[PDB]
Each structure stands twice: as structure tokens, then as C-alpha cells.
Amino acid sequence: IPMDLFDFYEQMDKDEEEEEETQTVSFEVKQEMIEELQKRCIHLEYPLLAEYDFRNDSVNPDINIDLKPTAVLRPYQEKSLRKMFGNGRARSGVIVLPCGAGKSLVGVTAACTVRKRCLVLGNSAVSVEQWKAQFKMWSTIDDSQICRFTSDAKDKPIGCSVAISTYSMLGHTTKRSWEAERVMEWLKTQEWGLMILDEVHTIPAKMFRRVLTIVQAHCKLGLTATLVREDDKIVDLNFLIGPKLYEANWMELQNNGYIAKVQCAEVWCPMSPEFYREYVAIKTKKRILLYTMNPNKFRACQFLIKFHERRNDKIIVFADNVFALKEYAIRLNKPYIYGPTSQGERMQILQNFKHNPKINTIFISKVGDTSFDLPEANVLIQISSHGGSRRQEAQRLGRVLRAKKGMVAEEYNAFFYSLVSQDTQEMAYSTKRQRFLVDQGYSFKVITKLAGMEEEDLAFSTKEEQQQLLQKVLA
Amino acid sequence: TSGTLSPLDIYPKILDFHPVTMATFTMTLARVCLCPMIIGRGNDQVAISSKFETREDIAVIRNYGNLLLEMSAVVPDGIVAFFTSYQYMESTVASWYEQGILENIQRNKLLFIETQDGAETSVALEKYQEACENGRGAILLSVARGKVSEGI
Amino acid sequence: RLGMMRHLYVVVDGSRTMEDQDLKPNRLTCTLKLLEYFVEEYFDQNPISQIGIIVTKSKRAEKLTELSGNPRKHITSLKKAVDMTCHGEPSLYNSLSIAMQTLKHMPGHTSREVLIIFSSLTTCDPSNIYDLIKTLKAAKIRVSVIGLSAEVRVCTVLARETGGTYHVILDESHYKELLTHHVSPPPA
Numbered sequence: 001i002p003m004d005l006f007d008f009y010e011q012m013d014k015d016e017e018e019e020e021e022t023q024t025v026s027f028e029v030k031q032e033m034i035e036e037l038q039k040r041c042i043h044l045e046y047p048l049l050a051e052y053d054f055r056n057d058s059v060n061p062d063i064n065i066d067l068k069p070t071a072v073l074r075p076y077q078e079k080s081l082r083k084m085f086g087n088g089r090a091r092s093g094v095i096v097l098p099c100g101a102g103k104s105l106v107g108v109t110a111a112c113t114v115r116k117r118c119l120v121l122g123n124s125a126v127s128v129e130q131w132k133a134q135f136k137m138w139s140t141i142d143d144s145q146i147c148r149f150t151s152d153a154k155d156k157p158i159g160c161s162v163a164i165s166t167y168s169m170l171g172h173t174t175k176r177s178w179e180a181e182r183v184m185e186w187l188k189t190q191e192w193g194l195m196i197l198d199e200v201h202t203i204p205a206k207m208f209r210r211v212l213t214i215v216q217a218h219c220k221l222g223l224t225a226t227l228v229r230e231d232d233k234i235v236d237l238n239f240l241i242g243p244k245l246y247e248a249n250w251m252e253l254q255n256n257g258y259i260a261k262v263q264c265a266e267v268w269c270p271m272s273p274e275f276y277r278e279y280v281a282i283k284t285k286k287r288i289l290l291y292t293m294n295p296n297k298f299r300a301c302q303f304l305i306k307f308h309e310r311r312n313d314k315i316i317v318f319a320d321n322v323f324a325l326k327e328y329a330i331r332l333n334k335p336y337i338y339g340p341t342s343q344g345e346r347m348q349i350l351q352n353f354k355h356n357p358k359i360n361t362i363f364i365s366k367v368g369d370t371s372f373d374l375p376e377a378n379v380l381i382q383i384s385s386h387g388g389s390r391r392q393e394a395q396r397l398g399r400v401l402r403a404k405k406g407m408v409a410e411e412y413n414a415f416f417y418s419l420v421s422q423d424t425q426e427m428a429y430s431t432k433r434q435r436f437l438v439d440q441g442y443s444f445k446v447i448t449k450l451a452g453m454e455e456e457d458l459a460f461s462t463k464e465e466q467q468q469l470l471q472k473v474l475a
Numbered sequence: 476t477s478g479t480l481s482p483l484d485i486y487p488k489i490l491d492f493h494p495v496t497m498a499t500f501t502m503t504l505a506r507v508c509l510c511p512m513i514i515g516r517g518n519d520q521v522a523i524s525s526k527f528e529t530r531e532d533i534a535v536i537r538n539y540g541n542l543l544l545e546m547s548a549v550v551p552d553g554i555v556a557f558f559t560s561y562q563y564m565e566s567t568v569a570s571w572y573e574q575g576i577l578e579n580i581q582r583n584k585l586l587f588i589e590t591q592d593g594a595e596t597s598v599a600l601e602k603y604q605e606a607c608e609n610g611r612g613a614i615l616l617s618v619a620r621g622k623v624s625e626g627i
Numbered sequence: 628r629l630g631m632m633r634h635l636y637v638v639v640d641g642s643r644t645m646e647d648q649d650l651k652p653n654r655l656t657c658t659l660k661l662l663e664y665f666v667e668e669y670f671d672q673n674p675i676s677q678i679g680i681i682v683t684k685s686k687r688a689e690k691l692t693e694l695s696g697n698p699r700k701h702i703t704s705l706k707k708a709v710d711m712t713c714h715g716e717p718s719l720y721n722s723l724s725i726a727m728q729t730l731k732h733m734p735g736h737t738s739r740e741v742l743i744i745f746s747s748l749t750t751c752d753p754s755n756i757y758d759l760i761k762t763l764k765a766a767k768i769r770v771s772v773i774g775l776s777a778e779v780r781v782c783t784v785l786a787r788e789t790g791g792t793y794h795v796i797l798d799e800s801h802y803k804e805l806l807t808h809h810v811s812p813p814p815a
Binding site for chain 3: 551552553604605606607608
């Protein structure tokens with residue numbers, strides 16, 4: 001019976017003296033006792049099923065957060081917290097929802113419900129500042145106990161939620177990675193007990209994974225929309241944070257005056273003289289530029305901007321590469337936003353795009369992801385298949401697009417487009433993209449021709465024009 | 476007697492005597508009657524704490540004012556809304572005569588306030604029996620203690 | 628069946644409440660569609676007869692078909708009405724006055740009848756409706772009401788006082804049963 005049972009720490013492992021012989025592990029591996037990774041503590045179901053239990057004799061009895069107030073979440077989010085009360089730590093650990101519908105609120109509520117000494121992990125200071133703005137109803141004495149805790153200073157019991165910090169490892173002041181042995185954990189190194197991760201996909205990377213791996217970490221919750229990069233690490237995240245409690249939030253459940261119905265499309269474009277000579281012959285990182293700048297595909301992108309500007313729709317055009325961004329945008333004479341565009345000029349372009357009926361198309365680089373209050377529109381065109389994550393295409397779509405007036409309860413009232421050059425490595429991404437969007441509940445189709453592109457003025461009207469671009473791209 | 480009294484105990488409690496008991500009518504099936512309760516329908520429906528129901532504006536505005544309007548507009552029949560006091564009744568229905576500009580029901584109902592008059596009471600019951608939602612016993616507000624309890 | 632001749636004024640509720648989806652597609656669509664089925668069955672049972680069609684909508688009365696003995700006008704009018712739908716609130720007093728004016732003209736041995744399909748709760752008319760009900764019973768104009776989920780007392784008295792036919796309809800099957808009862812002739 002476990003009334004005497006010791007349990008202790010060595011470098012990244014838990015060893016269990018004079019044992020109760022617990023299920024699901026090897027025995028006398030190198031001594032009479034059981035020995036697991038720290039990170040295996042998460043498997044509380046394997047003892048719970050057996051009817052086994054354990055005690056935290058290493059406890060520290062100091063004080064904790066109360067945060068008694070409540071707020072109102074979206075109908076699935078409320079169902080998702082209600083499930084978490086239901087399931088408990090044996091059968092909980094991540095939630096997936098867009099970066100534009102209430103993820104900050106799920107984190108402050110997840111900490112106010114769970115109610116333990118908490119450390120909040122985030123990607124960015126702006127997101128700490130959005131959390132703070134969310135959290136003001138549960139903030140103790142409004143503004144006299146909230147503080148930041150990162151590379152310049154630390155103070156107070158709370159802040160953006162409870163104490164927030166960043167994932168970073170540049171040196172001894174880049175907080176969570178550097179501090180990962182001092183505080184956290186109620187069961188050993190026992191100052192705190194609860195972990196809330198915003199942007200949770202960020203942690204299972206090869207160096208970062210160690211922050212999570214080198215503890216027992218009692219309660220853990222993660223929140224994300226991108227969930228994984230193109231190589232799919234996600235089997236690891238079940239171990240590292242916990243299993244996935246939720247994924248859906250389909251626009252099928254929020255149509256009539258609520259968000260958008262999006263017609264999704266992929267566009268297959270043919271390939272014009274000289275560009276495949278050179279695509280086929282070049283194996284280097286330049287070849288990405290011949291399939292993105294393919295003038296038949298540029299003419300589809302131009303024709304599509306013209307159709308939706310003729311109807312006065314608002315359009316964001318995404319370009320994965322600053323070269324591509326500027327070659328498309330300067331030719332189409334639409335503003336662009338990227339890293340080196342300043343805050344003053346970005347806020348002028350974005351205010352113009354949202355409120356000026358003359359400024360209806362803009363071009364944007366990778367800087368929108370991971371926190372660029374991207375503006376509202378009704379049309380999204382991606383010039384390329386990229387290598388950022390099929391799941392980030394759906395986060396980006398979801399956070400940017402809304403219903404056009406009048407038509408707020410129809411089958412579709414917003415539009416997404418991804419442009420693909422036929423007979424290239426750009427095509428490989430489609431059978432995955434298509435399967436992921438339809439599994440996310442989206443109506444998605446393939447457009448393979450445009451015989452009305454043969455009825456109007458567009459660029460690259462000759463071989464000589466196309467040759468002028470081909471020489472510039474090759475250089 | 477009092478019509479119903481089946482749990483029996485309160486009368487012997489009040490008397491400090493133990494009468495002979497008897498149930499002395501044949502009753503009809505439960506299905507002709509329906510006795511609902513209302514409190515909310517999603518997990519975000521938190522405005523009904525009623526720690527100070529006489530002061531909780533958000534609670535009066537939310538399902539107390541809003542559920543009444545949903546139920547009355549959907550179920551279009553002659554329906555009387557009973558209240559615990561005049562002050563609640565006045566706050567819940569903005570009416571033609573509002574206690575504030577900030578009150579949360581907009582729909583044709585009739586009032587039943589103090590200085591009721593025996594002749595004036597009948598006018599409101601003539602209106603409710605004749606037609607429309609509104610009248611006395613119809614889409615009208617009355618405090619439960621008040622005269623409407625005599626009925627017609 | 629032959630023995631006498633009937634005059635019947637079909638009156639339909641074209642108020643905003645008739646748009647509702649409670650009775651197939653919506654009440655307006657289900658009622659006009661079954662009412663077309665009734666006209667052909669009533670005229671087949673009653674070869675020497677007449678009908679006229681009135682609606683109450685947007686707080687007025689409008690004549691969809693004039694009083695006549697050819698069924699074709701009435702099914703063509705029920706077809707033409709569905710497109711223009713329903714909005715607003717009844718005008719029952721003005722509809723019983725135009726119907727009265729046509730019915731008063733008719734001779735001694737023919738019936739006087741008004742058939743009303745009712746999905747409202749009152750009517751917008753200022754005029755005293757009780758004076759007009761007294762006048763219907765003197766004139767021998769009989770008024771029947773088929774109501775949707777509704778028992779509002781002035782309509783029910785009005786159908787009882789004029790002859791005894793206030794009926795409630797809760798399905799498309801029940802409405803076809805009610806119209807088919809009205810297809811049935813009077814004694815002679």
C-alpha cells in the first residue's frame with residue numbers, strides 16, 4: 001500500500017524505491033525498483049484504470065490565486081471548458097482554435113478555473129499585452145499587482161494572466177528555457193504547478209522540447225491554430241503537453257449573420273515558353289521563383305484581382321517571399337506590407353485598406369502570422385503553395401476573411417484562392433491541402449481553365465515581355 | 476380545503492391539531508397540464524446570480540426581460556406575466572410609460588398598477604377576452620399578490 | 628349532387644403570420660395549394676354553384692377573384708397569389724362588408740356562405756364588428772373559420788353567431804379534412 005512510498009529525481013528520470021509494482025512499465029531494469037522519464041508522469045490513466053493512486057509528500061503549503069469572476073465565451077468554447085472539467089489531467093492537455101476568435105480568453109479562463117500557481121508561456125510581448133487587456137476583469141486591484149516577467153525585469157504575484165514569460169534561449173535572460181529548473185512543478189522542484197502555453201506548436205522543436213521534457217509538470221494546457229509545420233511533429237505533442245481535447249469550430253456552425261461561408265479554390269495554371277527549360281534545368285532555391293512568377297499564373301492573379309475590385313471586394317494577397325511580394329505588388333501598383341515597412345506606414349496602409357473605398361487590394365509577407373492584427377477582407381489569394389504549413393493557410397484564412405454585406409447568410413460570401421503552376425513540385429502540396437480543408441469542413445474545388453482570360457487586357461502579352469522577366473529572374 | 480393540499484403537513488403544523496384527512500374528488504390525467512421552469516440554455520448565460528435581484532440590472536435585461544420577449548413573441552397566445560413587485564414589473568417592461576429610458580422589453584402588453592378601480596379592471600379583462608395578446612389575464616403584467624388573483 | 632345552388636366567399640389571411648414555416652414550406656404555400664384542391668372538389672360535388680375570393684393583407688381587403696361559376700378562375704387566382712405572398716395584419720370587417728354586398732343580392736333558395744382561413748389574433752378595422760355580425764345573421768350569411776393554432780374570442784363568436792363552424796387545424800392532413808367537410812352540400 002503506498003502510505004510509505006518514496007519517489008525521487010535523477011538528471012531527467014524518476015526512480016521509485018520499495019515499489020507497489022505499478023502497471024504498464026519494465027521491472028528490475030537495473031535494480032529492484034521502477035524507473036521512468038519525468039515526462040511519463042502525464043500517463044495518470046494507466047494507474048487510474050488499474051485503480052492505483054499516489055501522494056505528494058514533497059508539497060509546499062503557501063498561498064494561491066482565486067480569480068472568482070467569470071465571463072462568457074463562444075458556444076463551442078464554453079462546451080470545451082465544460083469538457084475539461086469532465087475529462088481531468090488523465091485525459092486532457094491541448095485545445096485547437098483560430099488566432100482571431102477568443103484564444104486569449106480561453107487561457108485566462110483555463111487558469112481562473114484550474115486555479116493553481118501558474119506560469120504562462122507566450123511567443124511575443126504584443127500577445128502578452130493583448131492577454132493583459134483580456135485579463136482586466138480578473139486582475140487583483142486593477143493595475144497594482146499586474147507585472148511583466150521577462151529579459152529586462154520581474155515583479156508581483158500576477159500579470160498577463162499569472163506570471164508570463166517567453167520560450168526564448170539566446171542567453172541567461174531569455175526566460176522559460178533558462179529558468180526551467182528553478183521554480184515550476186508542485187511534485188518536485190515544487191514552487192508552482194500549472195503550465196499554460198499559448199501558440200503551443202512552438203515548443204516540440206528539437207532544442208525547445210527539452211523545456212517540457214526536463215520536469216514531471218503536473219497540469220499542462222496548450223492553445224493553438226497552426227498546430228504543426230509541414231513535417232508534422234504532432235505525435236510528440238500528446239506526450240509533451242497532453243492529448244487533444246478539442247478541434248473543430250467549423251464555419252458550418254456559424255453562418256446566418258455570424259462569420260462567413262468561404263468558397264475555397266485551388267487554381268491550376270499552365271506554364272508558358274522558356275520558364276520550364278529553366279525550371280527543369282535548375283535544382284537550386286531560385287526554381288521556387290520560376291513557378292511563382294510564371295506569367296500565365298500572374299495573369300490568373302491579375303484577372304482575379306480585377307474581377308473582385310470590379311465588385312468592390314476587399315482583397316489581401318499573400319506572398320511568401322519579399323522578392324516575389326515586390327515583383328507582383330509593384331507591377332499591380334497595390335501597397336505592400338512586410339518587415340522593413342515601418343509601423344507608421346503600415347497603420348496608414350491598413351487604415352486606408354479598412355476605411356477607404358479606393359484602397360481594396362494589399363500584398364503581405366510572412367509577418368502576418370504569429371501576431372499581426374491582420375485586417376478584415378472578403379478575398380484571400382496565395383501566389384504559391386509555400387512551405388509554412390497547410391494548417392497555417394487555414395488559421396490565416398479564418399482570421400482574415402468575413403461575409404460581404406447583404407449576403408451574410410448565403411452558401412458563400414467570401415473567397416480563398418491558391419495558385420499552382422502545372423508540371424512543377426508546387427503541385428505536390430495539393431492532395432494534402434485538399435484533404436485537410438475538407439476534413440476542416442470547408443467547400444473546396446479545383447479550377448483548371450479561365451477562357452475569359454482570353455477576352456481582356458492583362459500582362460505578358462508577348463514572348464518578348466515574358467523574356468524580359470525570364471532574364472531578370474534567372475540572374 | 477384549498478383545492479390541492481396533498482403533502483398535508485402545513486395545515487396540522489398551523490393548527491397544532493390533527494384533523495381527519497380525506498381526498499374527495501376523482502382527478503384527470505397530468506397531460507392536460509404542463510408546469511415549466513426557465514433559467515438559461517448555454518454555459519455563457521451567467522446573468523441570474525440573484526445575490527441582489529432587486530439591483531442586478533444585467534440580470535433583469537438578460538433572460539428575465541429577453542426570455543419573456545422570446546416566449547411571448549413565439550407563443551402568440553393570451554398570456555399574463557406575474558411579478559414579485561411593481562418595481563420589477565416597471566423595470567422589466569419599458570411599456571409606453573417607462574421608469575427609465577434604459578429598460579428592455581418592446582412589445583404591446585397592458586399594465587395592472589395600483590389604484591386599480593373595479594370598473595377599470597373589467598375594461599382590461601374585456602380586452603383580453605375579446606382579441607389580441609393584451610388585456611387583464613392576456614399579455615399584461617400584474618404583481619401576483621394583486622387583484623388579478625380574483626380572476627374572471 | 629344536385630338540389631340547390633351555393634354562393635361561397637373564400638377569405639384568406641395574408642398577414643405576416645401566414646409566412647411562418649410551421650405548416651409546410653410556410654402557411655401561405657400549404658393553404659393556397661390545398662385551397663386549389665378544395666375548389667375543384669367543391670365545384671365537382673356542387674356543379675351549379677358560385678365562389679368569390681378575397682384576401683386580408685397589409686391592414687386591407689383585396690379581391691383575388693370575382694363571384695362566378697367557372698372553377699378555373701379560382702384555381703388561376705390561387706396560383707397567381709402565391710408569388711405576391713403575405714405581410715402585415717388582417718382587415719376582416721371590410722372583407723365581411725364586400726362579401727355581404729355580393730351575398731345580399733342572391734335569391735331566396737341559394738345558400739349565403741363565407742369560408743375564412745385565419746392565422747392572426749385580432750383585426751385592424753376600427754368599425755364595430757358586433758353590428759356587422761348581427762346584420763350577417765339577419766341577411767342569412769353564414770361564416771365559418773378554420774384557425775391555425777388559435778381560439779381568440781371575437782372570431783369564434785363571430786363564426787357561432789352566424790351559424791356554428793369555428794374549427795382548429797394543426798396539420799396539412801387536418802386542413803385537407805376540414806376543407807373536404809366544407810365541400811359537402813347543405814339540405815334542400
